[PDB]
Amino acid sequence: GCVEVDSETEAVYGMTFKILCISCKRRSETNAETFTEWTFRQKGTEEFVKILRYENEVLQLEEDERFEGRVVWNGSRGTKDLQDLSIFITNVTYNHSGDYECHVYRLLFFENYEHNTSVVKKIHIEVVDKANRDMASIVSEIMMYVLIVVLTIWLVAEMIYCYKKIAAATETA
Amino acid sequence: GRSMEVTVPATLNVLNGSDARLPCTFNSCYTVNHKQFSLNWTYQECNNCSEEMFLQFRMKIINLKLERFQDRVEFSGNPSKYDVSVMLRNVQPEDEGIYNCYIMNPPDRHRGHGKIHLQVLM
Amino acid sequence: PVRKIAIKILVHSLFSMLIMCTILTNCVFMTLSNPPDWTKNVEYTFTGIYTFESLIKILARGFCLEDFTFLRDPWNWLDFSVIVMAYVTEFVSLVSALRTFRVLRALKTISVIPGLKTIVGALIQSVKKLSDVMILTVFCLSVFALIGLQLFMGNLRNKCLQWPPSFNWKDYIGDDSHFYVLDGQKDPLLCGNGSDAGQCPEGYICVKAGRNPNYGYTSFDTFSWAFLSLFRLMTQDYWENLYQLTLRAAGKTYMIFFVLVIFLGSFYLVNLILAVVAMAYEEQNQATLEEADCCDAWLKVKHLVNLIVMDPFVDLAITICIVLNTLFMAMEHYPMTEQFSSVLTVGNLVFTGIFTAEMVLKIIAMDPYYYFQEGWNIFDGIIVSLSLMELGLSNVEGLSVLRSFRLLRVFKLAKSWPTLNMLIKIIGNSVGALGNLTLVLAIIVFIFAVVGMQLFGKSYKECVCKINDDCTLPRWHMNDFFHSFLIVFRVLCGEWIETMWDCMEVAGQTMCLIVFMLVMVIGNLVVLNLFLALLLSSFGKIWWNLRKTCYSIVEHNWFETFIVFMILLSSGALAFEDIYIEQRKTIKTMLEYADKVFTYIFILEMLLKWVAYGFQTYFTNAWCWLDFLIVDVSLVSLVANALGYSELGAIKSLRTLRALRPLRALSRFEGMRVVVNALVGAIPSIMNVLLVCLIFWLIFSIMGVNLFAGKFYHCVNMTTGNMFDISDVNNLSDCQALGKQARWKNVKVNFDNVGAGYLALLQVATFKGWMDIMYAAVDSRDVKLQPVYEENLYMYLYFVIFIIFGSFFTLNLFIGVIIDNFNQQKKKFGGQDIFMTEEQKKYYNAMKKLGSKKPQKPIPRPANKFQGMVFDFVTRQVFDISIMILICLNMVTMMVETDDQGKYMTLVLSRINLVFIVLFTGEFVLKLVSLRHYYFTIGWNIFDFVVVILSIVGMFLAEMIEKYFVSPTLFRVIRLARIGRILRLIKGAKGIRTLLFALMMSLPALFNIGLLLFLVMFIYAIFGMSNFAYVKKEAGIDDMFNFETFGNSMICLFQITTSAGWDGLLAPILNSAPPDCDPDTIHPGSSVKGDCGNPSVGIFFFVSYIIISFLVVVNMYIAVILENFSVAT
Ligand SMILES: CCN1C[C@]2(COC)CC[C@H](OC)[C@@]34[C@@H]5C[C@]6(O)[C@@H](OC)C[C@@](OC(C)=O)([C@H]5[C@@H]6C(=O)c5ccc(OC)cc5)[C@@H]([C@@H](OC)[C@H]23)[C@@H]14
Ligand SMILES: *[C@@H]1O[C@H](CO)[C@@H](O[C@@H]2O[C@H](CO)[C@@H](O[C@@H]3O[C@H](CO)[C@@H](O)[C@H](O)[C@@H]3O)[C@H](O)[C@H]2NC(C)=O)[C@H](O)[C@H]1NC(C)=O
Ligand SMILES: *[C@@H]1O[C@H](CO)[C@@H](O[C@@H]2O[C@H](CO)[C@@H](O)[C@H](O)[C@H]2NC(C)=O)[C@H](O)[C@H]1NC(C)=O
Ligand SMILES: *[C@@H]1O[C@H](CO)[C@@H](O)[C@H](O)[C@H]1NC(C)=O
Ligand SMILES: *[C@@H]1O[C@H](CO)[C@@H](O)[C@H](O)[C@H]1NC(C)=O
Ligand SMILES: *[C@@H]1O[C@H](CO)[C@@H](O)[C@H](O)[C@H]1NC(C)=O
Ligand SMILES: *[C@@H]1O[C@H](CO)[C@@H](O)[C@H](O)[C@H]1NC(C)=O
Ligand SMILES: *[C@@H]1O[C@H](CO)[C@@H](O)[C@H](O)[C@H]1NC(C)=O
């Protein structure tokens, strides 16, 4: 099926970024018509100005200069039931580093009961200039190396101890 | 299936003047509902002429008060127990004929038929 | 003088034959569903003949005006009763009396031949020993049903109701249009409030408001329905649906209940029943065995023909020809083209010609009827005559079914094949020496079929629209005799409740319950007795210095347990590779580096084993080979990942081999190792008999191919998913003209070729998948033609016959060879109690002595007070029985519990429970006042002490939960002290005591086999998580029971372990190409594409797991059965 993953917290200047908003349906087989508002606020700015609107197939964007011709769609294509709301920001700059809101509005169809559900996904990004590797990866790599080295040391210590013991046992004869 | 098994005797005759119980009882498996149940009663004196209706059950009981015989007909049955026999008052020598009960109890698709000869015996 | 005339006629042989033939033709006449008007006179003739027989009996068993004559025999009562009820029915206006003697006249068939009385008596005396087993069965069923009643109380009625967009809550619950129907299920979807339970669709809320899931009958609300549902679980009839409904209502975390019952009720109680029936039949068998010109031309042609080779290529050439003919028949498939169909036809012609040549060469040398003496010669003549008739006809419609008869030539291999000869011997023995048992089984099936027909025919015809949406007859009805027989046969095969639901909804709950339980008991007992009868009627300056150190390090227990722990850690690191790993994103990298750590450490461990043992002594060991192969796979994966060759198809497929990492535990776990060794020791004979089974199933598969060969193709209305009717689409030319709305769908489990035939036969013989197969086969008309509902209604007989032979006699041969192999293996061991290590054998043979003990009367007297009379009163059997009566009353007042009971009723129940608790505590304190010294002579007193403490504690937490932070999901669990309070019944339940002691004695071997099964489940669940975690959400794979997560994979695998639902779990994976699926359907947050599973790997996975689980379950069955035999005998 589908799973909801959290978007990456940090972006890198000059390169591309992919902000994810996975609003998986609570029931997979239910037909739905999903559209979405994407907005955000700048760091140090207290507002929420709509930046784009995704519909059945077409993506619409405002006159905002921070995303004029530098954002593309990377959600579900040609399905009318999105279940994936991903913005691909090409040429990420310092214009966009703040708090994005993903307002996914889903009209779920049923027998004769159309439900009109709204979900909000808030994600914070902060563009940097150097790609900092995540703390979890660094800690895991350091722990891997420490475990390998300490276990090699334990193995060689046991081998030399057994070598001394077997020498003491064999020089007896 | 073939039809609906309706328990109606071949013929029954009532003494004149006394009240008569016109029987129409069916034995249907389905739990009847008072929203889709269909019933009607027909009276015939011909052999091959047009037939007219005088008593119906369609979401409720309807007595049309037929102008030929009388307003004698009355509801004396119970659809929930599958016995919808009716009540007849002031039996007269002109009441002799053949009476047919037509039944349609959803979700069954078979129209149960019940034939009786309304005569009078001493 | 007066009775002397009617004595010779009674014992006259032709009178017995007259009764024979009149009973037989009466049985033929009851077969008719709606007999014509002229059969009434024939019924009059039948009853007149019966009255004539009874008059003879009256005038023969009584002299000088005797009243009762044939009243000293059982079946004579039956005859008198049926004749009386026939004459009672003469009053037409007396009716419900026709269905009173006609279901009793059918019982006359039991006396069809003198001799069946002995078999029926033997069956009745054999079911007599089942008293303790059935009382324990009902005790465990009631205990488990009370557990289910307190846990899932009204849970099954949870239904996703839509939030009111507006009689309030009274006409909103009872609308049935406000719930969620799962797109063509005619039943609201079960839902839940807690996690790991049913997820309501967006805009729906789960409310405990509805009728019930299946026609009002599968529910836990009342103990009666709880008893029915857990009988369903114990018999494993369609329990996967109850499994899914209960786990969707209450939550996935409740499967622990099923894991117990499926092991405790469904598996162990069946083992007890089989063991005790086998014990009774062994006793019966041992008792029975201990009590018991032209002449010149003829001579020269005979010299020419007989005086030929005997060993060199006159009987081996024929075997080779038979094998080649079998291979040519198996080469048939669909769609077969010309220059191959012609090849097969000419091969068949050449083979029948050469067989005719051999027959004539044999008959002109053996001078019939001296040729027709050895049996095999007669069989060869018959089969070759059938082949000549079929080749001469070449157009026989509508029974070209005899064309497949040539497959019987394969049985000519039985001359040289000892195991095939043994199978043929068993098949013939059933119709020969066990002919009485076979006839009893057939007569009982016929009697149940006609009883069901007479009781429920008019019902299934008039009440039909309650169980069907088109108001037409369902697939399995009892309106006519053939369908009634099919339902009775399906009940024997195992699927009783699915038709018993329709029977309840049509023709009376109590009547259908009685009928179906009598069938489920009697017919299954007869089948088991026949199976048992057939089973038993078959028979260095630095180099070596470092080498010592490395050997010591490897054999050190420190290193051994360290390696075992890290193997467990590495195996468990695989279970986190869900479809949620991408949302985890931190344990993802943690495990990415733990994989490197584990593979480096395993490489070091392998090098240490090398430098300690030597290459020869390391590659001699199979376990070392397995570890070396796994290490090599991990090393190649690491090298590919380091070099950057990760995003390649071959490397990605080899990464799936990481699921083999748990296999290292085989060499480390002692019980797992010994069970694997025991399996490998028996695998040769198992393989030989499996080859026999393959040959038999190949015969049946070629027959099925001949019959169907792609007649399963049908047009599905693409907009809805249902089959077209022939009124609209009749053939392929029309399903290619409807266009886009017509797909010409296949079944995906069919008989197109021999491989698909093997798959379909496996489904049919496992009894989970045979449904749609038989539906399509019966519907089929002909190649490239639209099927019609039950057009070939009598092709049900094909599959019936298959289940009779290749699923019953084949299973009998398989079980017999397993018993023989294990008997020889344990006689060779010395030797007994395999599947156990040394520590477990010590535990077992010490526990044997522990259980074989008696109390050494260590209760002399209390110490000088009124406690003397207190002891004298407490120790009495009257008190010891009064306590049991109180426990039984507590059990009954819990059975009284029911969902949605009144507040006053609940208060009354609470007060009664409090009174029972205080009386139990008074009993405990009286025993304490008696024997304060020890009170602990036997563990039963300790069990009573702990259970009363636990009941008090549970009552206290129940009060606390009501008075403080409340949670029903915990209150229901904590209200389970009542279960132990009634489990105290085992104290006085003798027989139940020894059966539970046998279970507790067999626990070690069962635990070893369960550990091996759990390892197998872990490996196959990781395989599922790797492969089928993204397949489509078709029939068997839904939003909850799938392969996405480790929990879901393990629940699906536990479902499959009991062979249940594997057809449904394989159906979505068999999909290969559109429009069945989409090969490039992207779904977040995963980089994988496509929702179609590979059919080859799916079939391999499911078939291999079915075979492995079948072997493991057979091993568990034999372990429990031999433990019971050793305990009792
Ligand atoms: C071992 C599985 N298998 C094999 C056997 C043995 O071959 C000789 C032949 C084929 C038949 O179907 C496949 C069987 C029966 C049909 C049934 O429906 C089935 O369900 C899938 C499971 C069974 O039972 C259990 C507890 O596994 C019954 C059960 C039934 O009818 C029943 C159960 C309990 C009972 O008394 C409490 C009375 C009747 C099995 C065996 O008999 C114990 C018998 C089952
Ligand atoms: C699962 O949790 C939901 C969430 O609350 C529960 O829904 C609740 O259901 C009850 C009735 O079942 C509602 O109570 C009210 O009852 C009156 C009649 O007395 C009626 O008029 C109201 O319309 C309503 O039905 C309650 O409002 C409702 N909760 C919410 C938030 O709407 C549900 O009962 C739980 N189910 C289980 C099995 O735990
Ligand atoms: C396939 O079925 C079609 C109809 O479903 C056949 O076409 C004709 O169908 C009508 C039915 O009203 C028959 O009366 C005609 O006799 C049919 N045509 C012929 C030539 O017989 C069609 O024949 C069937 N077969 C093929 C190969 O298309
Ligand atoms: C994101 O969009 C770009 C187009 O700018 C495309 O090349 C890329 O493949 C997309 N990525 C995903 C994961 O869809
Ligand atoms: C991003 O846009 C700036 C605008 O001047 C340009 O200089 C730069 O090369 C662009 N980078 C990429 C990766 O497109
Ligand atoms: C960033 O924002 C400022 C102020 O809104 C704007 O003038 C500038 O052009 C933006 N950067 C780019 C690369 O357009
Ligand atoms: C309800 O659905 C309409 C479209 O029919 C949509 O415009 C509206 O935004 C939805 N409601 C909310 C709260 O989003
Ligand atoms: C498929 O079914 C629908 C509704 O059941 C019907 O309207 C449609 O005509 C069917 N398709 C064809 C090709 O008849």
Residue numbers in the entry:
A (entry chain B): 20 to 192
B (entry chain C): 27 to 148
C (entry chain D): 116 to 209, 212 to 283, 313 to 438, 741 to 987, 1189 to 1778
Describing publication, verbatim:
Voltage-gated sodium (NaV) channels generate rapid sodium influx to initiate and propagate action potentials in excitable cells.
To investigate how BLA modulates NaV1.3, we determined the 3.3 Å cryo-EM structure of NaV1.3/β1/β2 complexed with BLA. Strikingly, unambiguous density located in the central cavity of NaV1.3 close to the fenestration between DI and DII was observed, which fits well with BLA. BLA was sequestered in the cavity by extensive polar and non-polar interactions from P-loops and S6 helices from DI and DII. The binding was strengthened by five hydrogen bonds between BLA and carbonyl oxygens of T381, C941 and G942, and sidechains of Q382 and N972. The receptor site is defined by M380, T381, V416, I419 and L420 from DI, and C941, G942, M968, N972 and L976 from DII. No direct interaction from DIII or DIV was observed for BLA binding in our structure. The key residues F1759 and Y1766 are away from BLA at distances of 8.1 Å and 4.3 Å, respectively, which indicates that the receptor site for site-2 neurotoxins is distinct from that for local anesthetic and anti-arrhythmic drugs. The functionally closed activation gate of the complex structure shows that the gate is too small for BLA to access the central cavity. We therefore postulate that BLA binding stabilizes the open conformation of S6 of DI and DII at least, which may improve the open probability of the channel. Furthermore, the bulky BLA partially blocks the ion path, which would surely be an obstacle for conducting hydrated-Na+.
